[PDB]
Amino acid sequence: SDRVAQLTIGNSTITTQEAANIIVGYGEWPSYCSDSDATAVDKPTRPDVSVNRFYTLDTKLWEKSSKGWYWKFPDVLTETGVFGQNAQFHYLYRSGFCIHVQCNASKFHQGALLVAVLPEYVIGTVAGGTGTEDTHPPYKQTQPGADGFELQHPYVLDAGIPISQLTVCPHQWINLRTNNCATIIVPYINALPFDSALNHCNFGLLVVPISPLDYDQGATPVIPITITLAPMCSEFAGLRQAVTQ
Amino acid sequence: SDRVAQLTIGNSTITTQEAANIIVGYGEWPSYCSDSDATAVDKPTRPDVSVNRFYTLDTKLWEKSSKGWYWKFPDVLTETGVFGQNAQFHYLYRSGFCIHVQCNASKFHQGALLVAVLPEYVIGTVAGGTGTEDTHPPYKQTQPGADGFELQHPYVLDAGIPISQLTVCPHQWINLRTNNCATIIVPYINALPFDSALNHCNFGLLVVPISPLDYDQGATPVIPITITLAPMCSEFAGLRQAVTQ
Amino acid sequence: ETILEVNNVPTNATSLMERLRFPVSAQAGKGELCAVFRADPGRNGPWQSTLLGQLCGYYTQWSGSLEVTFMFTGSFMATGKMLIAYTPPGGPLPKDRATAMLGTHVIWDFGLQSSVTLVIPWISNTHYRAHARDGVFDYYTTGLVSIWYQTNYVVPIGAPNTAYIIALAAAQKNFTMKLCKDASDILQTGTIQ
Amino acid sequence: GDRVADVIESSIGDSVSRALTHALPAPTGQNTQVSSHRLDTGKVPALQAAEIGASSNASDESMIETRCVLNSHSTAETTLDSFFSRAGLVGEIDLPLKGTTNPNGYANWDIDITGYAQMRRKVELFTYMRFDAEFTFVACTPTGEVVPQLLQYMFVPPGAPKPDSRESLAWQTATNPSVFVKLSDPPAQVSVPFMSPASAYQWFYDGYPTFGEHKQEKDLEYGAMPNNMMGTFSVRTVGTSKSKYPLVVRIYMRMKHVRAWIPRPMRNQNYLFKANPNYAGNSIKPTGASRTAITTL
Amino acid sequence: GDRVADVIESSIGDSVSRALTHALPAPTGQNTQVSSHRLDTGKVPALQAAEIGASSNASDESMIETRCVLNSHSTAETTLDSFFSRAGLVGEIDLPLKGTTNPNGYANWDIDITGYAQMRRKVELFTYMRFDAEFTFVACTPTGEVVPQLLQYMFVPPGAPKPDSRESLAWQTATNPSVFVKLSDPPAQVSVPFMSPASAYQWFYDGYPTFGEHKQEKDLEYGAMPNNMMGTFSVRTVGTSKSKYPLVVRIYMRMKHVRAWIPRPMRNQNYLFKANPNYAGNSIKPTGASRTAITTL
Amino acid sequence: EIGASSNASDESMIETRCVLNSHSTAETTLDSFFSRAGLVGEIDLPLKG
Ligand SMILES: Cc1nc(-c2ccc(OCCCCCN3CCN(c4ccnc(N)c4)C3=O)cc2)no1
Ligand SMILES: Cc1nc(-c2ccc(OCCCCCN3CCN(c4ccnc(N)c4)C3=O)cc2)no1
Helix, strand or coil: CCCCEEEEECCEEEEECCCCCCEEHHHECCCCCCCCCCCCCCCCECCCCCCCCCEEEEEEECCCCCCCEEEEECHHHCCCHHHHHHHCCCCEEEEEEEEEEECCCCCCCEEEEEEEEEECCCCCCCCCCCCCCCCCCCHHHHCCCCCCEECCCHHHCCCCCCCCCHHHCCEEECCCCCCCEEEEEECCCCCCCCECCCCCCCEEEEEEEEEEEECCCCCCCCCEEEEEEEEEEEEEECCCCCCCC | CCCCEEEEECCEEEEECCCCCCEEHHHECCCCCCCCCCCCCECCECCCCCCCCCEEEEEEECCCCCCCEEEEECHHHCCCHHHHHHHCCCCEEEEEEEEEEECCCCCCCEEEEEEEEEECCCCCCCCCCCCCCCCCCCHHHHCCCCCCEECCCHHHCCCCCCCCCHHHCCEEECCCCCCCEEEEEECCCCCCCCECCCCCCCEEEEEEEEEEEECCCCCCCCCEEEEEEEEEEEEEECCCCCCCC | CEECCCCCCCCCCCCHHHHHEEEECCCCCCCCEEEEECCCCCCCCHHHHCCHHHHCCCEEEECCCEEEEEEECCCCCCEEEEEEEEECCCCCCCCCHHHHCCCEEEEEECCCCCEEEEEECCCCCCCCEECCCCCHHHHHCCCEEEEEEEEEEECCCCCCCCEEEEEEEEECCCCCEEEECCCCCCCCCCCCC | CCCCCCCCCCCCCCCCCCECCCCCCCCECCCECCCCCCCCCCCCCCCCCHHHCCCCCCCCCCCCCCCCECCCCECCCCCCHHHHCCCEEEEEEECCCCCCCCCCCEEEEECCCCCCHHHHHHHCCCCEEEEEEEEEEEEECCCCCCCCCEEEEEEECCCCCCCCCCCCCHHHCCCCCCEEEECCCCCEEEEECCCCCCCCEECCCCCCCCCCCCCHHHCCCCCCCCCCCCCEEEEEECCCCCCCCCCEEEEEECEEEEEEECCCCCCCCCCCCCCCCCCCCCCCCCCCCCCCCCCCC | CCCCCCCCCCCCCCCCCCECCCCCCCCECCCCCCCCCCCCCCCCCCCCCHHHCCCCCCCCCCCCCCCCCCCCCECCCCCCHHHHCCCEEEEEEECCCCCCCCCCCEEEEECCCCCCHHHHHHHCCCCEEEEEEEEEEEEECCCCCCCCCEEEEEEECCCCCCCCCCCCCHHHCCCCCCEEEECCCCCEEEEECCCCCCCCEECCCCCCCCCCCCCHHHCCCCCCCCCCCCCEEEEEECCCCCCCCCCEEEEEECEEEEEEECCCCCCCCCCCCCCCCCCCCCCCCCCCCCCCCCCCC | CCCCCCCCCCCCCCCECCCCCCCCCCCCCCHHHHCCCCCCCCCCCCCCC
């Protein structure tokens, strides 16, 4: 009852057998904007199927010497589907997300991941190492795309903050003895009712192994990690020509 | 009251001072499809603003030795806006159209056009001229684009049918002494509730001068003709990857 | 439900039972292709093995939604996930897994419940569909099915590295047929004596 | 929950056809009423504006002085059943002894009304049509002579095996229909339903049937919708050996239970091909006749 | 008209936030109740599953034997006003006689709390904050000595002319506010509203402010939202000639009427720059302390 | 393994619309499938054979 789950939104559908319960980020569901909070006068558009469905990004690999990854949302979908081809036309954007993660393994493998959702995860460089040299992170590390970007110093999450306290955010684990997936639902987290989808990046998904993968020879070494996600309650406003960036 | 008119749909708006009344093609308004007529089970999407607004195609010229033109709908909008970038994704399509035409001139100019809407306007070649040589019309004459295509034999409309009987269709004139525009509204005309937007081309707009343009020297010779149009009650279904053609 | 011959490559009389099932083995994990087939029952292909595809030979037009059920004959200690997809008409065959995803798709985890149901809904301009073939009658093509790897085929020491999947094609409750006729397959050479 | 206001006041989800007009009865022409002279301003029915694209509304009463006339002239013979339900030739099938067309005693005919222009030009006034039918078959030698010969007909729908010979196995006609008939008997005659997948037979399709890079070698499929190719009609002389007699078979169609849509213009140039509106370009004859002077008959 | 059904049953237009939870009062800690021994199956609070990502629910009562305890320990000092409404240093402004920073008797300070880490690390626990404030100004020479000198302050909002000198015309302060004050008087002290266009001060912005081809020479605008730059704070020694006395000015912020959102982790590496979370990479000290053996203290 | 067919439907796998199906099931019956004549025999009565 708590293990088996199904997720049907749009034309698409997900099944899973060895799962856990579902999480709702910060204790509430997505929503469309109120006429009181809102400020813009133009009538939005709300497709409700062509955008609110499961998109599948890219399939990583989990070796024994792996460190971690992150993805920025909603940057991941700005070149993918009728979602992306609306977000280029319009200027204002609002949405939620459901986020599903896959990693399977047998009953001889062992490991644990941490699947967390952090709003406004600014990236910070190392200041040249000495501390004095001021630097800034390039464009391909702040909006790396759908292909993700790998961490170098995961103990501080590349921002001077520990990973030991990342559970205060909406988190889940993937202990390969117990489960094989993590489902997280998130509302729209921002101070402003609408905001751009290309410049601003509202939150970042992280996937960091704590206990490393391990097995014995004769067993399958390739242990992929796949990332699936779906917009929800998507609105758009400010129509004009398409802007890549 | 009958001369001045305004047309507000979407973010856009049209004004005109010397016009005439509005026409409704074949005596009824557009509509969304009924649950009885329809056959497909998937839930459509209905943006209602991003697609149902005025698009402006291209601006022709009207000399004294001009013959005519045509445009195929809805081929004109398959590379233009969130309309076109939905029609490539999906497979099934339904819509109406409002069609507005411009041509201005002073009170010393004279001429008359005929602005007609013909469903299923197949194009026919000349059979080599002799009659025996079987030919077929190329792809750039059946789906010529938004840049339109010019007629060669307008007395038969390039299909063995006279232009003298084109008024039985939804028609209007632009007599430069009287008016300067023609507004035509059209429902969805097809035997099937949904149909593709790329292969099929449901009807063709025609613009043929009957009485030729004429003036005297010292007067402005450039007399453009602009074509404006708006989808209405647009639906889409069958999501998948984008198909140019 | 009746078995579907996705693996219709062999011809010789010893390996004809191999048509019934297609394998899945262990791979790198790049999201790669395994099998494809059309959703056209009355057309020559996998669907002729069925009792559905043989009763649509005695009837021209059809309608309704279809259903394709898969089943996994692997070991209990094996795991994996797959991405089944339905690519409607018009669109070409997907080249990668990130293109078939944009259509109707299902994801299935190997487990106790050893099966999953893909459903091929009714997406058509027409209420009915006469059967399809190469020519202008590809106006009535149904689409494509295109199976992919989502994670990998993982298995421990001691178990086999390769497994087999069996498929099972059928219809739903909105299927109909009309305009009865005679089939193409007339199983007679000369005189039955 | 639909708590916003732009969703409550929305026009989305309107399965109703707003119709400005509404049909009325007219079993007879209109009765001309009486009128008298008028010498007023403002009121002026003669002056119209045709730029709007609507027809006139002036009448005999409001232009001159008329009398009362009680018109009893019916409008029943201008209907569609009374205009279309009249048989006409649609096909011919030859089964000669020795020739080049069909010498082996069989023939296949692709069901297509568009081969004779008396009946094609009536239907090509409309675009979409929904009709039952009633075919009729007239068999005869070239001299008109009547001979004692047996014949078989077989409706071959789409997707069915077309016969390739006279002694074939497709003639068992277990599931297909068929009509045995002799020539000494009267004409054969059967009824037909509306057999399309669509909701109407469209005599004009502006598009291509398939997707693809439309090259010049595949432009012969312009104007081809398979929702009108209703199959094939086969015929043969029954036997194991060849026949003693030539034959010709003529097919007549009679439409009934008709509904039509989309008036459009009428052909004025000679027909050349099928499924193809092509015309001769160097021989564009006018729509009608001609004369020498506008000021003279 | 919404005549279809998929529009009636639609979830579109939902301005309501479905909340699973609901706040409750807690002026005191929870009163521990009495328990006794239990030797049952099924019931098993100790065994949790943390993969779900929720905290435990086992308590003292359901693991061991407790007594009744009537807890009166308040929870009032862990609130945000009782945690943030405590002044701290946020800035310094020097007006020396002869140097290199600000020798001409004026100084501009860009309003930014992020320059001292006792107060920065308290706010960087949260992401979005909405607060009034209460600044306080302490003037003194470097020795701490107090001198008879007159001073002027002027809040320069965005879009206003920054003064470029001591004898400038921007000091008329007709529309801008200002504070004349002496050093012989007590500290100056004024109140501040919530001045942003947005609905909250976000201490963390993940994005760029502008559109464009983001080249490497314009990466210094990463993490810059102008909805927090609340302007500039100017100060000068009143007169036409230079002063006899050096000066230093210290600025203290006290937050009140606070609301916060989005808990997130806490800094463990030393701060280096402003508007920039950078850390030293070759000097990553652990989060805390260390020892020699897990099996030993 | 039970040997029974599936029960999943369009409604419980994806998002559908309302559709009022009027497609008859009368031509799949047995009389409408079998009551169509066909050849079952041949009898020859030649002159000399
Ligand atoms: C026993 C036995 N049964 C029969 C028997 C034989 C034939 C029957 O089908 C008669 C259907 C008539 C079809 C009429 N249409 C509709 C559209 N269309 C075309 C054709 C070409 N181009 C275009 N653009 C349109 C056309 O031609 C039924 C019964 N006789 O023998
Ligand atoms: C007369 C006179 N009036 C005054 C007078 C002077 C100044 C006043 O504004 C005080 C507003 C306090 C602003 C506090 N915030 C909010 C966000 N934020 C930053 C800063 C840098 N980086 C980030 N990421 C965030 C920051 O620093 C009001 C009044 N004194 O003299």
